[PDB]
Amino acid sequence: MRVNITLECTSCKERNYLTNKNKRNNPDRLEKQKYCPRERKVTLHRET
Amino acid sequence: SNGRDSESKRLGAKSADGQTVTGGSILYRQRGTKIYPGVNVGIGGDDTLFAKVDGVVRFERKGRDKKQVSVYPV
Amino acid sequence: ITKPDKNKTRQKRHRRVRNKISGTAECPRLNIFRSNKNIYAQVIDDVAGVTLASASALDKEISGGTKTETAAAVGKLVAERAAEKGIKKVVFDRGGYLYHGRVQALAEAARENGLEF
Amino acid sequence: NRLKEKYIKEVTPSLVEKFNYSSVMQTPKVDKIVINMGVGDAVSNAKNLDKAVEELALITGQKPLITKAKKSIAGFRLREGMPIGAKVTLRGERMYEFLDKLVTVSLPRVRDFHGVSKKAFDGRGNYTLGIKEQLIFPEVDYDLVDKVRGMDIVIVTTANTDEESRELLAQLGMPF
Amino acid sequence: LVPKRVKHRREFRGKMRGEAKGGKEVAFGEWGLQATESHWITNRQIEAARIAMTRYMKRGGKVWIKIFPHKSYTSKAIGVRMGKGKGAPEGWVSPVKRGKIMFEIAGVPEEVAREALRLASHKLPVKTKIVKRE
Amino acid sequence: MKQDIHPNYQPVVFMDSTTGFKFLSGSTPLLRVEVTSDSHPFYGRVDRFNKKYGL
Amino acid sequence: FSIYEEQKKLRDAFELAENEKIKKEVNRLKETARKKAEWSMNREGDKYGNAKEKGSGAIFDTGAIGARAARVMKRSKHIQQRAETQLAEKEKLLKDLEYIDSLSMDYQPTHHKTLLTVEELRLGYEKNWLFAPISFSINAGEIVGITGKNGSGKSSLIQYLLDNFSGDSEGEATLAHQLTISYVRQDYEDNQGTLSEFAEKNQLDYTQFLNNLRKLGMERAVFTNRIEQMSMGQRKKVEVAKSLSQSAELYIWDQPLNYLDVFNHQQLEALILSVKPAMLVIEHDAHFMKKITDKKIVLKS
RNA sequence: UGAUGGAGGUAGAGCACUGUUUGGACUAGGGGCCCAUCUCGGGUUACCGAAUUCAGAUAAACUCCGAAUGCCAUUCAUUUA
RNA sequence: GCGGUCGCCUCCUAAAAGGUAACGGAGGCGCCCAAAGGUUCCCUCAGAAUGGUUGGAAAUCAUUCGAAGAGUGUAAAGGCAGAAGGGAGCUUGACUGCGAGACCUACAAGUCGAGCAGGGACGAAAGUCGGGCUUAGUGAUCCGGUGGUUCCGCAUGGAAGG
RNA sequence: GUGGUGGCGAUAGCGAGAAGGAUACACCUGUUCCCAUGCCGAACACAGAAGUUAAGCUUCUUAGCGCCGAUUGUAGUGAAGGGUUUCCCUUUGUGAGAGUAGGACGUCGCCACG
RNA sequence: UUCGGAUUGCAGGCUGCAACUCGCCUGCAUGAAGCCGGAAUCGCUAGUAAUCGCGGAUCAGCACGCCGCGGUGAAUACGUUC
RNA sequence: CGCGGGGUGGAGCAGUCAGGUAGCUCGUCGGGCUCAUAACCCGAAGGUCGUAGGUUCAAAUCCUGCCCCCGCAA
């Protein structure tokens, strides 16, 4: 239910982040604005 | 049953009054701020006090019944 | 029925600001006080516990009946006195009020007149 | 605003001549009037609570604040944070209009209104009334009064005392 | 006597050096029973002495028990080797230091008081004596 | 007073035709009212037996 | 699918039988373990005597006494470990089963022995009248199977009954006075949102609703989903559960049997044949209507 | 070793919190008895008694307090190594 | 031998630094939170008395009393009402590379960390933000799997495979 | 003298009582605008200056509450010993807590105005 | 339901020394159960059944009963397996 | 004090694993059939599953305790 999760830069398709979430409370595919060091900017990181 | 306990963690003071010390040192480990931070002193996630710059450690009463740590350099 | 005293509530919020702003000789406080009528503005080194400049609508030099414009005027004048005293940088102690009205106008005036918060 | 003009002109001299105040700012002054409606049955279905919100709105012209529990009580299947009824706080001209509406319309319209209690005070100069039965003026909209629940109607003052509050409400119109 | 509730079943036996903090002078009654030695005193001892005093007084006067058995005490069954934990609580006890007053009496003449306390003293383990209030 | 949440609260008249009393106050222009402070008062079996059988 | 039925029955038989074996044997071994253990403890009691009687002690070779007691406990433990291995074998079982359940139905009849009548009803659009005129009736405890081809006008008839027919009508159709309908339609797309909101829009008991859903076979991990997300069979189960939870006197079922499982077919048949309420039914599974109804009525142009 | 400055809540003491606990004043409340019974309102065993209060106690897992020692440190002193 | 225990956290024991054993006393953990985080702004609790309708012993309303007697996701301890407690906005710093220096430490590990750089959040700004109130929520290597890679590629180019 | 703003362990506080508003601070009149109230211009914010300082706020009295706090004496205890050794005693040194005597209804500054 | 009329409140009428226990009738108002009745069971073959009212005996007053009276007026009986 | 197995209408039992809203048989009560009783037929009553709480939309069921019964020990 509570699962460990690799996020991913939608552009680079690079994972770049590890995190946690419920599936009940956070069923929709999580997203954030996180730093991609390969681009050295901030970018929409989407769960995968 | 009752036979178990955890690793004792080595809290309390680690630097003494009137003692010169390096920056980034540790002065007082603690769980909960049994002593507050003061001059040139920070506080960590685990409420541990650390001197940001060099100087002599000085402990002081923060008024009536709460304590303080301070680091006055030279 | 009783009512809270606005000044005492102001002082509570004020101390809560004091615990993370304090004036020094290199970056003093600009300490606001605000009445129903007038507005006072001190400039303070908390290290020595001594002021460096003052301003008020109660100083014969202002223009404007609107309290916000009096606030702007005292901002101009306290900025003038500070630059005369020999400092440009300062911390803005909002006194326990909101940075919205008279206080905002005063601080914006002083920023324009040269100071660097 | 007739009630406020009365409070300024007729009440205050007639009050100070008795109570012997060395300043008009010792005058008892109505600071607010609070309405409350506890429901409880809303825990069964809060549609009745929506209805109570509706009636407070129709009564006052003022949306109410829904109150909520700070506790859970197994005796009533009650959970903290759930909506126990509603309240309103009138202040000013709206408050005076509401009180004047009470005295001049809806205290008579109770079936057997020969008066009200005199002892219903807190010992500190603030009055507490209670409507046991709804439907006390025409715009209660009798066509959709599903249930009579009642109201608590607190009347807060700057009055130091029972006596000040009682005399004030006497001159204002409350038929003790 | 028993405490109706306790936070911790098992306790330490403790120590008994030194005189008593309080209960050191007679307060409610006219006469009292002072301990000259420190010792543990139990439910059964207290109740036996109380009954002795009451019967010799013929339900006259009034008695006051100042001590109380707050503490417990364990034991192992005969045949049990040491270890494998701590024993089960047998009864309840009061550690009574020297200088302590245990029983006070009033509402009864002096000779009757002395004799009743004499009886209770013979029932108790402690070396005791008589005390009188001013 | 916020917008879009409060009912329309308009000055209206309350009228007691029993006494003709005319009052103004805000509610949700002239309205019908039966009784009020200016028209309300507060602001048997022996007899019946005797009526039925004169005594 | 017949072969699949046979082989899955065989699998289930094997699973259940092996589970029963394991349960029986584990209980046996636990009993024997406890008894061997008590025997060992009684032997350990021989290390010691009795204080009440003189001479019982002074015991010699307590080491051998304890050794033998230990061997008996080691028997007990070997037997317990066997039981644990058998439990491990058990845990691999009962995974591919369904655990079928019955259903319920909030049928609420009244004095109306005539619940619906139809008289000379010829029905259609633009006077292209869609089926020859019919007269029939639905009484209490009577089921009526209205049938015909596709586009024969069955849902159109239902629309004429419930007054939302946008076509041309000639003939009579009369409900009772204050009759309550429950309703399972052919076009349930309109349902949307969570179930705690669906059951508010449709005045239902949330508990009875989810109960009838789980009895139909929806796992309770699904109640957190949305009707937009559910499979078509699950949406269909939502519709059927609405119907079964609605206290009603006539039931109108427009193809409940489409997007469901064989288990659900069986549940519905068993329930309707057990209760025998007053119902209008529309199906193309002729076998189902044979199992239930004799009053069958074939509308046609 | 001395001087100085610190951390620290132990023995002791105390009840200012948390628990245990004695006696007394008062008492919500709980018991019967009777009158009144729609079982409705009382009046008493100096009936059992929350809670408050007075006085007295108690504690390893209570502290309003709090040592002696011991500990850390002093480009401090003395003596040794 | 059975029972119980084996890893981790909290208290007492533990003898006012730290540490300290027992088959000594008591309890917990093998997670949760997308806001229960961050920032800005604002607020202060529990209970008692009084009064009031259903509504009672006790829901909700109002005043006073009210120094914490509450709450702090979850055990106990410590601490917190200058809030770490509570509420509402804007967000995602629950960032990347690091890291002087200290604490603990047999080793392996564990803990704290100012400060620098990049690129940001909030805020007017100061300035805070490298998860939560602090301390448990975890386990080596080998071996496999997934993604990326400017690395290698058995004479060369690839490929296999690392 | 009032107001603002800081430091010192409330010896500063809490309660009660008296007086005052010259300026001042305040209440106070409103919602016109910036802005705001899970409802309300009560609070926030804005504008004003009819009125009263009644309250708050200042100054004074009060030792009722709370705070501080000796000296003496004791318990405890380091070191050195003794005894009849789960404890008790002696020499020396230190030395509480409690209970008091007593203090204490503030001290130190900076700035603006009168 | 304008069904059904119970029950209940109020006013009256008669009888009779007296209508509370404990009468009959009327008016007003309320307007319950009950939508043809399980297992089972009863009467009846012709002016019968079914239904409709009328009178009388007792009776100061009071019967949905009893006795009698007449009005309207069916269906069925294959047949003795049971 | 501990370890196992039990507490479901009056009796005996499932349902407990796998939460889905209390049932099987007998018995009791009432009415029918019968000359009467039994059998038979038609009806009903009797339990929130030992109990106080949690988890859940929902608990006999899962969790935590508390109180009784049968074995051992004791």
Ligand SMILES: Nc1ncnc2c1ncn2[C@@H]1O[C@H](COP(=O)(O)OP(=O)(O)OP(=O)(O)O)[C@@H](O)[C@H]1O
């Ligand atoms: N609005 C319309 N206009 C014209 N014809 C229509 C309309 N709605 C339906 N029809 C036609 O009516 C006929 C039957 O329609 P209906 O919806 O009643 O079918 P049905 O009985 O449910 O059929 P099926 O077995 O396919 O479900 C079909 O020929 C259809 O095309």
Ligand SMILES: [K+]
């Ligand atoms: K003795």
Ligand SMILES: [K+]
């Ligand atoms: K007659």
Ligand SMILES: [Mg+2]
């Ligand atoms: Mg942390």
Ligand SMILES: [Mg+2]
């Ligand atoms: Mg169709």
Ligand SMILES: [Mg+2]
């Ligand atoms: Mg002690």
Ligand SMILES: [Mg+2]
């Ligand atoms: Mg230590």
Ligand SMILES: [Mg+2]
């Ligand atoms: Mg190659």
Ligand SMILES: [Mg+2]
């Ligand atoms: Mg090659």
Ligand SMILES: [Mg+2]
């Ligand atoms: Mg002292």
Ligand SMILES: [Mg+2]
């Ligand atoms: Mg015949």
Ligand SMILES: [Mg+2]
């Ligand atoms: Mg029978």
